[PDB]
Every structure is written in structure tokens, then in C-alpha cells.
Amino acid sequence: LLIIFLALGVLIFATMIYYAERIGAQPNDPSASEHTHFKNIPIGFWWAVVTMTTLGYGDMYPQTWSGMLVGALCALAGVLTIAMPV
Amino acid sequence: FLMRVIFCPNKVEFIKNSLNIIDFVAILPFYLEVGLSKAAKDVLGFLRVVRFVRILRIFKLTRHFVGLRVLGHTLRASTNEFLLLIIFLALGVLIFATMIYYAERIGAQPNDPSASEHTHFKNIPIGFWWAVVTMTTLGYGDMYPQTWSGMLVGALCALAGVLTIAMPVPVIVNNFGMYYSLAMAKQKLPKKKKKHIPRP
Amino acid sequence: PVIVNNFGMYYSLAMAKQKLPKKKKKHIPRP
Amino acid sequence: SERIVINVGGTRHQTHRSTLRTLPGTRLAWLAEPDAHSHFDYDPRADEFFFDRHPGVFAHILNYYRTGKLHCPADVCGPLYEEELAFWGIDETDVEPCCWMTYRQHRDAEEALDRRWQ
Amino acid sequence: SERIVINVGGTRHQTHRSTLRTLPGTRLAWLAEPDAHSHFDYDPRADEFFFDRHPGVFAHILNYYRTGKLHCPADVCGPLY
Ligand SMILES: [K+]
Ligand SMILES: [K+]
Ligand SMILES: [K+]
Ligand SMILES: [Zn+2]
Ligand SMILES: [Zn+2]
């Protein structure tokens, strides 16, 4: 149950943060994402694990208001979905 | 999907079924290639956002799990505690954001024209972000207080966050524990044969 | 945990008192 | 001739024979039958069968016979009630889901926890 | 004629008729009335009404009749009570 909850949360929040961080993307740069650590989704998996476990290394964090909302939701949902079966 | 459409009893509930809605929304973008100039760019930009839901098809598989049904029932049956948690978090975030923004300006250097130059807390919404990150004991470290008053406010924020998070979460967890125990009991117990034949 | 248990007890009792419909005192006491 | 008095450890439990006759194959079912004076302990002076068992849990066993649903008394250990209903012939896999997790708890824990110079 | 003995599953519960008459409309209220010999099970040799129910919880039901506040015995399941 715990591994299923973690996998679902990680996938959903990784996709959400990757799409949120691209709203504030600068149009000038040719690449889709240049100023954000969330250049792709697997990086989102790593960040989602680190953020749901309330670890918070700080190597990668959202830098956009939408990203900040997604990050707050990720932290809260991680606390809940970890405190369910433990 | 076509094979499932072949037999669709009670089409009203079939359309109301969220799983089939997710299926159709996920299958729409690819099938829209043949349908798809000026409006086409906008509909493609929104079609990417629609394709974002393609990950939601995993719930079709995970619906048969017991733990997820228990979690859904817990969420639906603990709305009051979620409202309490969001209210507590909003109040704490607002109060501590204002407090840290005003604390970090006490030690502000008079020389710089701007009000705050050496502090990450240049305004209050940044305070909202920092307050969430600090109350959830996350602590990214992208922004942190750099003044003794700011440090006092930060310690108070961490403690109050621990407390106002640990208030309703135990209630929610107890609800889930009760539901999961009962569901596992009902799943484990072998089907009864009603030994007790009632008297007329 | 002590503080959390206090809050849990108080919240459970308050929700009980809020949920329970207003009684009509069925039991008419004897003189 | 419809009433029957069970004396369980000195406490008189009284019931109708139909109630005992509901659940067949168990000990009390054999009590309800008319050939029970010889099979079981019985004194004609008080017309009571005597069983040398805990009465407080026999209350709940007889409540199973009466209502039809088996519950576990929350004031006795799991193994105590298990052994009592084992004596009375009741199957233990009949207890209701409301009191199954607390009943089958200690047993789950216990099962989980378990040439000269040679 | 003020006392009434209830035999609930072989355990004699004794009380005054006023106590039963407090809460009207319920079964024991009908017991307290003088037209109860015919309605209910009753043997004149011991002057007891017999109910084939769990006595341990009838203690708490009768305590509701006596004091006026209904409580749940913490030694029986919720569904049983
Ligand atoms: K932590
Ligand atoms: K941390
Ligand atoms: K950190
Ligand atoms: Zn024991
Ligand atoms: Zn029960």
C-alpha cells in the first residue's frame, strides 16, 4: 500500500510540477525550460520523493508561483500519504 | 473502448463514470490529428494540456486495489478535518509571513534605497512560500531568515507548524486505520453459510 | 503527543455535541 | 416443557428449547433434545443442567443462540473466550467483523512470533 | 403492588412500577401497566415476567429508566447494544 501510494503521488506531482514550471518560461530561449530545475519528468520523480518525505534537500525547488502552489500541495499530500499506512 | 461501447447498459451512469470520462479525454488528442490553422495552434496548445491527463489511466488499474478504495472512503468521510487543516495552514502561513517580513526589515541597512536588499523576504507572498516550506518541516533552504529577529520568527514558525500540522492529521490517520482494519477483516473472513437457522 | 491527544479528545466531544440533534427529554422524572 | 434452565458455574441461565434448537450440532443443541437427562449432568430436584464453566461468557454464547450473531465480550481476553467457545462447540470463524480484529489479535501475534565430540 | 420483577435470561431484575412508568411508549412502560399479565410472558408462581434476552445489557437499559440518561456499556460491541 505504501509503495503504491508513493508511486502514484510521485508520478502525479512530477507531471504537475513539470507543467507548472513551464507557464512562466521565458519565450526567448530556444529550449522549453532553461531557468528551472524541472527540465523533464524524472527529475520531477526525484523532487517529488524528496518533497513528500519532508526531506527537502534543496538541490531542486520550484521557482514559479504555480510551481510553489504545486510544491505546497506536494508537501501536504506527501505528509498525508506517508502517515496513512505507517 | 469501442468494444466497451458495444455493450453500455445504463448509458447515463456509463457517461457519469469518471473512468470512461478519463478514457475519452485521454483518447481525444490523438484522434484529433485528422480533425486538426489559426484556431489549430490554440487547440494544439490546449491539447498538450489535455494529454497531461494521459497519466490518469493508471487509476483504471488501481481501482481494483483495496487500499485505494479505503483511502477514497477515508477522504470522502473526513472532509471536516481537511477543511480544518487548510484553515490552520492558511492562518499560520499568513501570520508568519507578515511577521517574518516585518522582522527582516528591522536589521535593514539604511544605505540602500530599496526597503530590503540583503533579505530573501522582499515581500509577503515570498513569506507565504517560506512559511509553507518551514511549517511542513521541509526546509529547502532557498530562502531563510538572516536576522536575529528573523531567526526568532523562524523558530516560532517551525514549532507552530509542527503543532498545527500534528493537530488534525492524527484524526485523519485514525479514520483511515479504522476503515482499513474493517475492510481487511471483511476481506479475510471466509464467506459464511448462516449456521444459525432462525426460528419462525 | 499529549497535546495532540488533548486536542483529539476536545474535537471529538465538540463534534459529538454538534452532531447530536436537540433532545426533547423523553424521560419525565418521577416526583 | 418449553423452558430449560442451564446452571453454568452457579448462575442460572434460562431459555426456551427453541432457542437452543436453532443452532444444530452444538452442545446446547443436544441439550434441547428430550434425551438429555442421561447424556448430561442434571438434578431433578431443581430441573437444572450443571456445567462447570465461566458464566460471564456463556451469557454471550447464549446471546449468539438467541439473536443469531456471535460477538466477543470486550471484558475477557481473546484466548479465554476462544477456549470457552471451543468447549461449547461454537465455531470461532463466526464472530462478527465488528469484533474479529480484537479477537484474532493475540493469536495472530503468537503465530507470527513462532560422534562423541560433535 | 409497587414492585415488579423482570426475569431477563434467568437474572431477576427488580424495580418499582414508577421507574418503568417514567419512559412511556416503550416495552417496559407497557409492562408497568396493570394489563400486562395477558400481553407478556408471566408465571404466577414466581410473579416474574420472562424475557429471553441478554441480561448484562438490560442492566444498563433499566439504569436508563432509573436515572434518566442512556449510556453504552463499554464491555459489549456497538452492534450488540
Ligand atoms: K522533516
Ligand atoms: K527537512
Ligand atoms: K535543505
Ligand atoms: Zn488472557
Ligand atoms: Zn460485535
Numbering used by the authors:
A (entry chain C): 347 to 432
B (entry chain D): 260 to 295, 300 to 463
C (entry chain A): 433 to 463
D (entry chain C): 7 to 120, 170 to 173
E (entry chain D): 7 to 87
Paper text:
Voltage-gated K+ channels of the Kv3 family represent an important subfamily among the 70 different Kv channel genes in the human genome, with specialized biophysical properties to sustain high-frequency firing of action potentials.
We achieved 3D reconstructions between 3.1 and 3.5 Å for the different conditions, which show only minor differences in the overall structure, and no clear densities for additional Zn2+ sites other than the known sites in the T1 domain16 (see Supplementary discussion). The polar head group of the lipid is stabilized by interactions with the imidazole group of H212 in the S1/S2 linker and backbone interactions with Q409 and M414 in S6. Our maps also show densities in the selectivity filter which likely correspond to K+ ions from the purification buffer.
